[model samples]
Target chain A: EYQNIFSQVQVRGPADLGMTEDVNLANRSGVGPFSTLLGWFGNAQLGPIYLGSLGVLSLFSGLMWFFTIGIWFWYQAGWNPAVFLRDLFFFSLEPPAPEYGLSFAAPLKEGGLWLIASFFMFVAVWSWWGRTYLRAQALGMGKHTAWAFLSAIWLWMVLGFIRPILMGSWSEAVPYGIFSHLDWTNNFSLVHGNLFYNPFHGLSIAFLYGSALLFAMHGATILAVSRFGGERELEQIADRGTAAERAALFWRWTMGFNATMEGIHRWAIWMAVLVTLTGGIGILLSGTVVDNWYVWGQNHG
Target chain B: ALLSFERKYRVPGGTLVGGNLFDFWVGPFYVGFFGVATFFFAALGIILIAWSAVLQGTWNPQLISVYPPALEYGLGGAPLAKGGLWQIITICATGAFVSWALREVEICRKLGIGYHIPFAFAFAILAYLTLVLFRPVMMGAWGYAFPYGIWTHLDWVSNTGYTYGNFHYNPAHMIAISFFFTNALALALHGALVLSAANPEKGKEMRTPDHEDTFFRDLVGYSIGTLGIHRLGLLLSLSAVFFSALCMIITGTIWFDQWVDWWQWWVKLPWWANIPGGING
Candidate 1:
């Protein structure tokens, strides 16, 4: 038994050695100790020098050309015969006035014509390349050949026809006048701009809350899986090490953090269901709660 | 003699009529000398880049200095490590100065350390200062001037007039510019610092590996190329602004007026309105 335990210990590598040492040494060192300390000193010494040099250079350059080629250029470009010659050329040119008008028929005639042509062209090219690449890879041109052909056709149809259909329906429902009122001028000007007026603000907030719920659900699932499998593994390796040694290693690596299937799965499912139900209820309630409150106040008055 | 002459003349000292001999000779001489010195420095930078191929031969491995192991390790872990000491210091100094200024001012003193006051005030001041210094030149008044116009002419000929200011105006732009300057300076400074610190320079292992040489070369080349690309973007943005401004001026379109009216409409809209409107709308 003692020999078996020794063999097991050897398999796990040196008792003193750990995974953290290797990871920490390589990955965590740069931001850890010395660089942070030295960086501060380096900035204090060098920062002003560079800024001063730049300022001096700008001033020097500014003054240098004040008297020389500047005077010469002003005389030649502005005060000389060239100005009159440039004006003569400018006056001679007869450019047409700009036209601005949008026609609904333009898309059907010009845009739709190009779109249909491009769709067919893309289908032809993609099919040709797809067939050649798959053939080169020694993939059997059997059911895959038919599937690829069908998929390409479907893709083109979806992109060219189905997507536009969906987009047009959505665009019609979403009034363009709404977009016209959006204050694009001061977009990103302030933090408040992001918080108050950003179009994605609601979506982003929902996603954050949704992601937290998802993370918890996923974590529970992992814990459930590990509980059964990890316990079995631990049992297999148990009795191999001394009680104290095993406990120390377990605590160090946090191996005992895994939950049993019985401990995790039921709780995980309930939590996930609760979160989903709560989210739906909250969203529904938010609309009616204020309305109800307003009605209640009005009725009471 | 000069003092007595000045006293006798009672000439308003530094001006042409009342100027002492020292003012005429020393002042002009110093100005001319300093002007030449500044040109010399500028020329030196150009000369270094031009003569790098000749003077530096194949990239010298000896020029690459190995950082202390501690520094190399520390850089991986700390916030300061990400941008080196210079960036960390600047950020800290600026933050401290801003905080102090906010606290010392009586009106601002009433405000707590809230998100709104500090960042808003800093951004406002930065924006105002930037406008004061850069707005005139950007509006093309400086572009019409003599020496200022020369820079503009160079920019126009280079097809980069619009982008140059946009690219190099901010701290981020300065940092990008410093990458090139750092690389050039590093070639010399790295060696000097290591030698100075580990005196009796012969004892220290100064030579870097081939990989380091390749790394620096690639870093410098890529950084400079990226700087050029960034400048190009800046130029394009500038050009767009210039042309847009010109269009507004020429067409006499109530673009700004229309925009303000539309914004106001949104701001006045109810929060739960079907029409998605502006903040406060």
Candidate 2:
């Protein structure tokens, strides 16, 4: 029994561990007490987990940041032991002043912490991306996860590095304090007239909201027909006049159309992807192609 | 009726602390040490909220607010009648959240399972802390924290957003919102996929993961597999909160200008600025 338990404890992804079978993503609505319980608690494992080279690098990079920020905060607090924690949490870690545009600040004192922190930050995130790709390869899975992650990396890079470099000012970058950064956002919008009229902004919002609505519809359709063996709608799609057929008919009767199971996923993924895709475009164009989005809209019209 | 299979897994001996002291269950619910801790912390926090509301002379859930210390207090605690109640409540809230996660850990230990559930929950807690603790401390005032009230907290959000010209212009905010929407998409797909698998035609047996894989692979040219889908779903879900915390943390900590102005880099680029028809001109 001990050996049996020990064998169960090998380190692996939840996918490889057979925990997904217990997920029961469907029968979650009005099923038996146990069946109704959601798999909110995810995969279980016991053993020393594995983290490949990239994962280790990611972890080390993260710790480098932890120390960088920690020392910065301690310095900000005047290196006093008593106020170190309070200042660490409360004091702000600002970027170089506008005067220091595109130049390094005073090492360990000025915006030097921000510079080091950004370096480690990129390393950590990029390493995570690498690790994600490696893990997918090892598992013989698609690279969709890695690609999706890169989109996120794209957004951050544009904000933290690309835009700052283009502007020729480290001050163009955001501050590192919680309230201070929010202040930056509010001030940024005010200075630019209004972001509401930005076309890419609108597109991103549309996709975001559209994804939500699409998911609701898809989720409801599945749950609504759950008891009728509609859970096997994918297989029944090939058959005639079955649960899938009835669902399609019901959707058609309610609306004018119904998305095929495959088509619904296509719609959903596009909506999800376009959110970052278009938002990045808008961010890239904000001050370049158009200074004020509102003014740009007026002039173009 | 207790399932016979469940009994096999319920052989005890997985308490993280207090060797079997608080390991027993009350009825169906497992009562670990953290479970008891969760109750006490949550109960105290809830009771304090009521007491604060009573003092405020309003029981309306929306109207009742437990406010943090005024900015004048800086990082220090305030009097109980002032923002001290909120400070204590914050502590209690943190305690309860941490305790709940630990309880999850204890349960997982008993089952000899992975800690993904608790690990995922930690992001949610982190998001909350970013708002209440991390952000407030960074800004040098507890008052920066939103009040603990349904309506008031929203008002705080609105006021806070307007302070930065427009919240939507914030890049991290956009990313976080995107993650949220994407999470919705993943859930809908996974839920639909599983439902489609379980519900077969009348007199037909339930389908297998093969059919699920075939549907996606046939349509999208590739499938994430049953396990990969779950993993991806969890990542999407966590990303929403993680980015939310990121969005908020970076709002005042790193980014300093208006989000719109953050785009000035585009206008300032050599290709654009040096050109005759540049917007900068």
Candidate 3:
């Protein structure tokens, strides 16, 4: 399948990849996923994928802004990404909140509304995207993986919906920024005791790490199967191995799983849901609903 | 669309390891040996909870908490009012969960799909066992297990969490979170690859799995094909919950103290002893 995409590997834009011929778009997405993010600044799609993302971003942008501005403008939140990274590990000290002139944050739960409302708005539209995205892809192109990737929606379902209901505060659901959100987790974790020690939270975190690795694995495997391997002749065509070889490589894992490719997809999707989904079970248990947030820390200390 | 297929596959007689004594259905429900066993165990457990509730005196679900024996009750077992009810109830609960899994097996056999469904749930069972049996036994008390009550089990989860620094910082917790976190991105990639084909903008036809593979070929020079994508799925599934149970059990018994502090080993490593910020920093 020498096709068009491979020959145009060094594509600079939609035109470069010959994307103009394939997709039918209202407006083209700018360039990449970033362009979709950039597209939010105005109208016009350059890539169909990015264009679609821009559509979803319109709805989620409300929450997305709230996430960053919620913390950034927080009368009490910090702004340094570097310091924020440090705060993730050990809490040297609390980064003081902002109380500036026209700084943006509205103070206390006032600004916290940004956190809550945005989180809600994001899930709402994202779910809206899911209903249509799956149907059209599934029957025709089978790009049904859009539904597959929105695992963050699971996080939204929890942190925005379930967690706030249980914890009794919109702000309690979560923060979505590097600096502000990490601070929230660290502080919330330590409030009752070190969050790092809560067994359920730990379970969630392990999966957190796991999901990241799995993310890397799938991407790498796709690249490995597509770009590497196979003879030089195939290399000139797609530069990747043949399709059957990729499937052959997969049989390598059948010693563990993979009876059918569809079967494999089914297993992965269900597991993907469970991975982030369980964190709600674990994190909610950290607070009043369960009260087991940090007794081990108590006992250990 | 499904009824015709159901009729074709409903012929029965694929019991992996049992006679055809109870190999039938109740309505559309499968009622194999394990199905009956699940009913028996669940019934017993529910009844025991009610009896305990009556003895404890509360119709309130929140107030009714069935607890295991005191640590003083030791391994021998406790009295009915004291903790004996909790012990038998435990057996009933385990019996039910295991039976339910086996019932699923019978269904899978009947339909002739891969065993991945039940096999994955098997890890979930392992995760639960970590809390009630594995962790408790390791710590030397039936009390370590959560109480069987609406509010109380919640209490136990929190208390269990607090007993350590914060389970979020715990290695196992991170592993679980990371695994879950990892999935969304991959799923997005795969979903997009296929959906990009499936989800054409209005007025265009959806793409096939071949075009789906080609997007990757153009982007990365390889397509995992339709099948390879799913194979990746199987690999992702097992590790997700497999470590959930491990994280649950390892939280306190095997590794004591704050999960934050546990990282001190890396923080204090001599390998980085003279690094820019120093090892601990």
Candidate 4:
């Protein structure tokens, strides 16, 4: 079964050439002293030239976006209190009441509907683009689309839905247990408790878990892709080609590097997960202990 | 022990420097100064665009001379004039100088200049005079207050802090100063791009059809990966703006609490009191 899975893909080699033919070609296209000097200077300048061009373009676009949208929001949020209030209540139910009024009616309903619609639209557009690009790569390669879509859906569910629910439950129970041990009666007012306090632990826990899952999944994907077959062979072939042929090989190597780097990038998800878990556990344990101690001192006093 | 001279003099939140002659002067000065600065930036931007156009005309004459290719061949032949020499030079010089003096060392590297000792001293002195003598006058009445003038003043007063003193900073001040300098740098960059797009160069050999074809092929092939970067940046910016607005709203609940208590007599509240109930009963 392993042998069947590892069917060989033919790798081509350069044909043998006569010395006279090689000499004649070199004579026709050989570099003069000035050309050689120019080539040496150009070689040094090329990387900077491309990098500078890219940087200037990026900065240009970034500035345009910053001034138009970024500055507008900065002004609205930083300066205009009224706009800020409207945004908070309008978007999130968790914010404090005076600053952000609670409204389940017009804005939330309208916004949610629009969000769902946009989400669906995004899915449709993304699917179409993915299908088209995958199909263009090769004919039979199109079957991988189903696998890709399935993996994305599974990952989303684990990271987005499952982790948050688990964390939210943990946060509520842990915090409530702490307050209970004090014999200090907690007033669970709707506005104070529900609006402010409840959401804090819930969101914090959700963020911790969600980020961890995302990181772990990313790492797994990177490991799998980086270790995929034929990568080493491709690199070896690229190492031995002629100048223009080597340039061509470099381009191919770049494509392979991109694919490999993308896999490596996914490993970041695992790192994120590990860091979040370590930090979250340490903080939660330390915090609970500190709170319990504070309560004991107060009661003794 | 943590509170020192630096911490003591630091501007507290909502502590407005109100009802002063300097405050009054600052309002109009900022408006006029920003207005004039914007005008010059725009004018220079246009000149830079024209310079780019001239360069493009020289190098890629076919783009201007003939009609653009049809849509069938995947070639729109849109003239490229978004960046060139003027932007490169101005961004390198004036923008880099201001940024370096503000202690934005990263921008200095970007502009291809190392930190200059003499320029740093000169800027420190100038920054101090501006902060002490001019900033207070310029910051007064700008309906919305920004930390630019205040920060510039702090830098001036410290005489760039001599790199050693009791005035060694706090993280909050550092963060605020970093943000201020970044915004200035961004503004300069924008001015540079606008300059590049408005003016271009002329009189050079036009790229051949073969070269154009190759360029288009490369663009199309690479566009998918490039789009990923663009989309990610857009998503981050949008999300940050959304969350920041939400934070502001949450902070406003304090105001709502005061309002509800004051209006209790006239309003028969719902289950949620601070949040306004239905119009009447």
What is the overall TM-score of model 3 with all chains considered together? 0.57
Worst 10 residues of 1 chain B by lDDT: B218-227
Which is the winner by lDDT between candidate 2 and candidate 4? 2
Please list the residue runs of candidate 2 whose C-alpha ends up more than 4 Å from where it truly belongs after superposition: A1-301, B1-4, B201-205, B276-281
TM-score of each: 0.17, 0.51, 0.57, 0.20
Local accuracy of candidate 2 as per-residue lDDT tens digits, B121-172: 6777898999998988888899989999865775687678777766776777
Candidate 2 positional error at A101, Å: 49
Superposition error at B31 for model 4 (Å): 32
lDDT of 4 by residue, A163-265 (tens): 3244332112211111121111122212122211222333443443333222222222221222232212223233421222222221221122212222322
- Docking quality category of candidate 3 according to DockQ thresholds: incorrect
In model 1, the runs with Cα more than 4 Å from the true position are: A1-111, A114-301, B1-97, B100-124, B128-256, B259-281
Per-residue C-alpha lDDT of model 2 across residues A1-301, encoded as one tens digit per residue? 1211012233333222221232332311221112111222222322112344665688899999778877766656566554543233245677777778887755656787888888898899998777655543333334455565566677678778887787777777777664467667667666666666677877886777566445444444443343354445445454532435434533442233556654655565566667777877777776656778778877863
Candidate 2 local lDDT, residue B62: 55
lDDT of 1 by residue, A87-204 (tens): 2211111111112112123342223323333334444444443432332122111222223233334434443344334434211111111222122112211212222222233343
* lDDT, residue B110, candidate 3: 58
Q: Give the DockQ (2 decimals) of all models.
A: 0.01, 0.03, 0.07, 0.01
Clashes of each: 17, 42, 91, 42
Better-scoring candidate (lDDT), 1 or 2: 2
Candidate 3 wrongly placed segments (more than 4 Å): A1-96, A101-183, A189-301, B16-18, B184-203, B214-225, B274-281
User: What range of 10 consecutive residues in model 3 chain A has the weakest lDDT sum?
Assistant: A2-11
Q: Name the DockQ score for candidate 4.
A: 0.01
